[PDB]
Amino acid sequence: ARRLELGEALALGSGWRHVCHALLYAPDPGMLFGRIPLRYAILMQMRFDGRLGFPGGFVDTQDRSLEDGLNRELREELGEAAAAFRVERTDYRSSHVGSGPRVVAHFYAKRLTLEELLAVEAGATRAKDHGLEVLGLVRVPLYTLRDGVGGLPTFLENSFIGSAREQLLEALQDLGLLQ
Amino acid sequence: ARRLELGEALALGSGWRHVCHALLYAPDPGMLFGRIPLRYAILMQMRFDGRLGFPGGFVDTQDRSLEDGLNRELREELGEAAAAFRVERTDYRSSHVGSGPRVVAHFYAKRLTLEELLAVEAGATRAKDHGLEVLGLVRVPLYTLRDGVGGLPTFLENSFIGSAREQLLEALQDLGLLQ
Ligand SMILES: O=c1[nH]cnc2c1ncn2[C@@H]1O[C@H](COP(=O)(O)O)[C@@H](O)[C@H]1O
Ligand SMILES: O=c1[nH]cnc2c1ncn2[C@@H]1O[C@H](COP(=O)(O)O)[C@@H](O)[C@H]1O
Ligand SMILES: [Cl-]
Ligand SMILES: [Cl-]
Ligand SMILES: [Mg+2]
Ligand SMILES: [Mg+2]
Ligand SMILES: [Mg+2]
Ligand SMILES: [Mg+2]
């Protein structure tokens, strides 16, 4: 997929559709097996097509902004606990265009408290999309286990939608997790 | 992995450890996009190692039966809603031994009502293992989308622990889903 500057994406003609997705994350002081730092809780979802992706969806003709569309979709996807926050332009990270349909994909990362993130997980089964478009939420393991394979490297071998794997890796880099 | 009859597995010496996992499923009359029959809700979990597997765990020295160990582990894994049912010997399907450590893996499939299954999903964030060994629950997409790839075939391209992919496929066959 080609990366576009936000200005260029916003200048695309009306035939282009805009989709927005968000990486929700929270600092986590927890330790797996009492010794492996978790560092952050970072959410993805298993999608209806058997691929991992981020929560979000299409901006429609009555969204006044990309961010209004994103928050509307997040709340459909994830349920009422997503109404505890708004993802904003300050959280914007990137825009990409893939091959095929006229779709531009905008990506955001939003910091939550761990309590807010847990609340999103705890309420997700009541979301409109649960058991339809969204098959379940999962956290991303950020550590690599002693065999050098288990954890993040194996997680990254799963199937991902569109540019989601690249969006994840860019965000993990920006968080200082790939040093 | 080699398949063993239950009698043979139960005759293994004390140095062998026994692990038990369960496929929990419920009939689901729902339709994706109003046209694709879901057929069943079937649960798996994203594990700490980045692989998909089934809920369960090790039988210990104070479990009086394989099934007591299974139910104890399920309830640690999944939380209080798993106490609404017991997986029993009538639900037993298979035993396998892989290479390496002395572990025999017993597999079960347990029918729930859709309300019971939803309750398991709805309560899983309060489980002891949530955000540690268990990164999230996911449903298995049983359909194949119009491109011939999306849905089950793509789901099966994800990373799976041990014999979990084979256990899934055997269960799906037994349910008549691979006709
Ligand atoms: O998490 C994601 N990151 C980036 N693009 C995505 C993600 N999820 C869906 N898409 C894209 O969003 C559009 C709609 O996909 P859908 O979710 O299958 O309806 C397609 O162009 C997908 O590639
Ligand atoms: O869902 C599963 N199906 C079959 N074996 C499993 C499953 N999950 C874990 N195991 C096995 O259970 C044992 C313990 O694995 P652990 O969950 O990583 O502690 C190993 O022998 C794994 O291969
Ligand atoms: Cl380890
Ligand atoms: Cl389709
Ligand atoms: Mg969505
Ligand atoms: Mg949507
Ligand atoms: Mg377990
Ligand atoms: Mg356990």
Author numbering:
A (entry chain A), B (entry chain A): 4 to 182
Provide the authors' original text about this structure.
Here we present the crystal structures of apo- and IMP-bound human NUDT16, a metal-dependent hydrolase of the NUDIX superfamily. One member of this family, human NUDT16, has been initially described as a nucleolar RNA decapping enzyme specific for small nucleolar RNA in work based on its homology with Xenopus laevis orthologous, X29.
In addition, the IMP-bound structure contains two Mg2+ ions. In the IMP-bound structure of NUDT16, the two Mg2+ ions have an octahedral coordination. Both metals are coordinated to one oxygen of a glutamic acid carboxylate of Glu80 and Glu76, respectively. The His24 side chain is involved in π-π stacking with the purine ring. Furthermore, the hypoxanthine N1 and O6 atoms make hydrogen-bonds to Gln170 and Phe57, respectively. Two phosphate oxygens interact directly with side-chain Arg50, which is a strictly conserved residue among NUDT16 orthologs and is involved in phosphate interactions in other homologs. The lack of direct interactions between the hydroxyl groups and protein residues might explain the lack of discrimination of NUDT16 between ribonucleotides and their deoxy counterparts.
